[PDB]
UniProtKB/Swiss-Prot annotation, chain A:
PROSITE patterns: RIBOSOMAL_L16_1, RIBOSOMAL_L16_2. This is Large ribosomal subunit protein uL16. SUPFAM superfamilies: Ribosomal protein L16p/L10e. The gene is rplP. GO terms for molecular function: rRNA binding; structural constituent of ribosome; tRNA binding.
Swiss-Prot record, chain B:
Part of the 50S ribosomal subunit. Forms a cluster with proteins L3 and L19. Forms two bridges to the 30S subunit in the 70S ribosome, contacting the 16S rRNA. In pre-50S ribosomal subunits interacts with RsfS, which may inhibit association with the 30S subunit. Pfam families: Ribosomal_L14. One of its GO terms (molecular function) is large ribosomal subunit rRNA binding. GO terms for biological process: cytoplasmic translation. The gene is rplN. This is Large ribosomal subunit protein uL14.
UniProtKB/Swiss-Prot annotation, chain C:
The chain holds residues 150 to 366 of 366 of the full protein. Methylated by PrmC. Methylation increases the termination efficiency of RF2. Its main location: cytoplasm. GO terms for biological process: viral translational frameshifting. Keywords: Cytoplasm, Methylation, Protein biosynthesis. This provides a mechanism for the protein to regulate its own production. Peptide chain release factor 2 directs the termination of translation in response to the peptide chain termination codons UGA and UAA. The keyword Protein biosynthesis applies. It is found in: Cytoplasm. GO terms for cellular component: cytoplasm. This is Peptide chain release factor 2.
From Swiss-Prot, chain D:
It comes from the Bacteria. Residues 1-38 are annotated as: Disordered. The chain holds residues 2 to 55 of 71 of the full protein. This is Uncharacterized protein YqkK. Residues 24-34 have a biased composition (Polar residues). It comes from Bacillus subtilis (strain 168). Residues 1-15 have a biased composition (Basic residues).
Length: 136, 122, 217, 54
RNA sequence: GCUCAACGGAUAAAAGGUACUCCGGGGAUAACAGGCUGAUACCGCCCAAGAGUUCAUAUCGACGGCGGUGUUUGGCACCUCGAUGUCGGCUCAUCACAUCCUGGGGCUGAAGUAGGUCCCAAGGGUAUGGCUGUUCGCCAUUUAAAGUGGUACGCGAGCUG
RNA sequence: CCGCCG
RNA sequence: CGGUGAUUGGCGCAGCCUGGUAGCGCACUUCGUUCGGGACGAAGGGGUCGGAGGUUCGAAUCCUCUAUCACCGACCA
């Protein structure tokens, strides 16, 4: 569960999730799991996909998570009326736009990278795809 | 017509003196129990030298009723009091070794033949 | 002797509990011998010890024979239990057993929890909301799951402290004769060392290895 | 009379017991008292074998 | 010269109870029930780490993921405050199928008996008592089985209280 | 005045 | 649940509130008294203040949450 050590403010606004992504290229490794769909990605989902990728590649090659959560999601307790403040910071998500390369790996064959990324993307809410790095 | 919460006298010498029917066995929602009918009973009274004690739950079969049996010619044999023979709780064999009072022809089957050999009349 | 053995072995004698004697001696002591193979060595110390000497606290010089019981357990300090959820936590929500409010007229708040391990069943019914009954029923789930954990720890350790506590004189090992002829003898392995001072300075290693070598056969 | 400690033990064994005497340390089958060989007073006036005087 | 700080400051000077209560109003505003939603709850499915002697997928299924139902606890206050009578029992029911029984199947870690799980199927059936106001639950003894829900948590111009 | 125990 | 008030030596409490400056009693250690033990004297040690993070030159102390503990309220239908 990745989470910001010593963040500035405790809570933050909801906001929107518009636009396309920024890190749209495989830059560190050679095989990448990219996002076709929008949505949020919790730290639990990110650690679950990372555990699937590590257990699939059996601790070979390098693994890059190209997203950190850094957005506090609050939640109101239940049997509690509306108003009377703001809910407690319960989990942390990372906003994900289409085209965001979520994961990267290197040092693994391509078909085993495809299987590791399939086992990853089974555990994520958003639609993904497998992209390869390219020169220029 | 033995139903539940019905007190019965005891025909054999098994030690009980008055029992109470708590369950008419065999068939859901069953109201009554005729003569050749197994019931579940509790022992509400016993003799001190009995094989069974007061407050035990075991099995019995009726041998006499006041409502009485009806023969195929239309005859009816009404006794004076409802009596029962205390059987075993699982093997359905009588506890005692003797039988007081008469029984009917409706105890003609192998288990109740073991009963009916010991009976004085039929 | 036991601290001079533990520190020569390199172990750590922590001395959890202690109680002095009135004139001389001790009245009770409970040690913690931090070591790798600590209980594997100190299995050989279970049972009473016999000391035959002349008491310096005497005046007549009577031979004083003395008996000190030694109970030595292995410690755990495990405390490793978090949840149970891999089985079926069979829960139930029902109207609580109460009057004097709108609980009997309107809604159900009470929570029963049933476990397949050892049939732990817990009721929480008195907090005006079903959700806090689930949360406090989880707290009183752990508040007896940890208790039964201590019950099973204690039930194992009671078998440990009652393994061989029925033999008559065979529970008496380690006669430390000082006054007439000065020999230490073990009464289960039949070995003996005639220099009792080197034994009392902590060289019970031969008496432990002979014990394990006998109980291995 | 049974002691107040034993009455508290009985109440706590009826009400969700543990039987703490199992967790008591088991005494040996013999007696562990202090054995002292006799003094010169005791041996000098023990009067054994009671042989008459001449 | 005012913590006239309830800070555009009614007076220089002021706390409570009311189930003994009363009036004027409000569905502008709560309790019940309906509505909207579905966090929660329940039911189902996706991935498969692992358990299952071997073997992910007979049976389970972690980390996580996606739905359905309206079905628990809720959220909101849309209907009703010129009145929509609550819980439980009795009597009488009717529908759903996410089937307890009977009926038909596939797989089985299915020898047989008896099971486990899933698929099809709603024609009929689906206890009596002890305790408690209890629904529920526990217990006793049965039963082929003692189904889960909807119906103003069915049913007081039908009864009880 | 105070002076318990073995 | 929140509201409200505490965690200081091995124990029970101070000190906190006012920012620099941790002590009381028991207990412990050594010596003395005594045949010895207690009692009593005489010397001596004892904690970096629940945890973490900020204020400030500086925090046991001022705030901020997190843990633990105890009290109070958790209502009307």
């Amino acid at each position: 569960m990745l989470q910001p050590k010593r963040t500035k403010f405790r809570k933050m606004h909801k906001g929107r999730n518009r636009g396309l992504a920024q890190g749209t290229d495989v830059s560190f490794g050679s095989f990448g799991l990219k996002a076709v769909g929008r949505g949020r990605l919790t730290a639990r989902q990110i650690e679950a996909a990372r555990r699937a990728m590590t257990r699939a590649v059996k601790r070979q090659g390098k693994i890059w998570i190209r997203v950190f959560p850094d957005k506090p999601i609050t939640e109101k307790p239940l049997a509690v009326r509306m108003g009377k403040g703001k809910g407690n910071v319960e989990y942390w998500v990372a906003l994900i736009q289409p085209g965001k390369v979520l994961y990267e790996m290197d040092g693994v064959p391509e078909e085993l990278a495809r299987e590791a990324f399939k086992l990853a993307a089974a555990k994520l809410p958003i639609k993904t795809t497998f992209v390869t790095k390219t020169v220029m | 017509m033995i139903q539940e919460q019905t007190m019965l006298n005891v025909a054999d010498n098994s030690g009980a003196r008055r029992v109470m029917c708590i369950k008419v066995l065999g068939g859901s929602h069953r109201r009554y129990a005729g003569v050749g009918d197994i019931i579940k009973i509790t022992i509400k009274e016993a003799i001190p030298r009995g094989k069974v004690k007061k407050g035990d739950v075991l099995k019995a079969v009726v041998v006499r009723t006041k409502k009485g049996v009806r023969r195929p010619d239309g005859s009816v044999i009404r006794f004076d009091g409802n009596a029962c023979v205390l059987l075993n709780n699982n093997s359905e064999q009588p506890i005692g070794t003797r039988i007081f009072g008469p029984v009917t022809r409706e105890l003609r089957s192998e288990k109740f033949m073991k009963i009916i050999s010991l009976a004085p009349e039929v | 002797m036991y601290t001079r053995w533990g520190e020569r072995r390199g172990f750590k004698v922590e001395t959890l509990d202690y109680l002095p004697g009135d004139e001389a001696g001790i009245k009770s002591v409970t040690l913690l011998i931090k070591g790798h193979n600590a209980y594997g060595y100190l299995k050989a110390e279970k049972g009473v010890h016999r000391l035959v000497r002349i008491s310096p606290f005497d005046s007549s010089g009577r031979r004083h024979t003395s008996f000190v019981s030694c109970e030595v357990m292995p410690e755990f300090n495990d405390e490793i239990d978090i949840d149970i959820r891999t089985e079926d936590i069979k829960v139930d929500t029902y109207r609580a057993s109460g009057a004097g409010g709108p609980h009997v007229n309107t809604t159900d708040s009470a929570v029963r929890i049933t476990h397949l391990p050892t049939n732990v069943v817990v009721t929480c019914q008195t907090e005006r909301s079903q959700i806090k009954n689930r949360e406090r029923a989880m707290k009183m789930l752990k508040a007896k799951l940890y208790q039964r954990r201590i019950e099973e720890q204690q039930a194992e350790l009671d078998e440990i402290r009652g393994e061989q506590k029925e033999i008559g004189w065979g529970s008496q090992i380690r006669s430390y004769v000082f006054h007439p002829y000065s020999m230490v003898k073990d009464h289960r392995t039949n070995t003996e060392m005639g220099n009792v001072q080197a034994v009392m300075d902590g060289d019970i290693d031969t008496f432990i290895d002979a014990y394990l070598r006998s109980k291995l056969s | 009379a049974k002691s107040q400690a034993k009455k508290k033990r009985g109440h706590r064994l009826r009400n969700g017991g543990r039987d703490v005497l199992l967790s008591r340390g088991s005494t040996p089958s013999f007696s562990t008292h202090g054995r002292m060989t006799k003094s010169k007073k005791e041996i000098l006036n023990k009067r054994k074998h009671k042989n008459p005087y001449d």
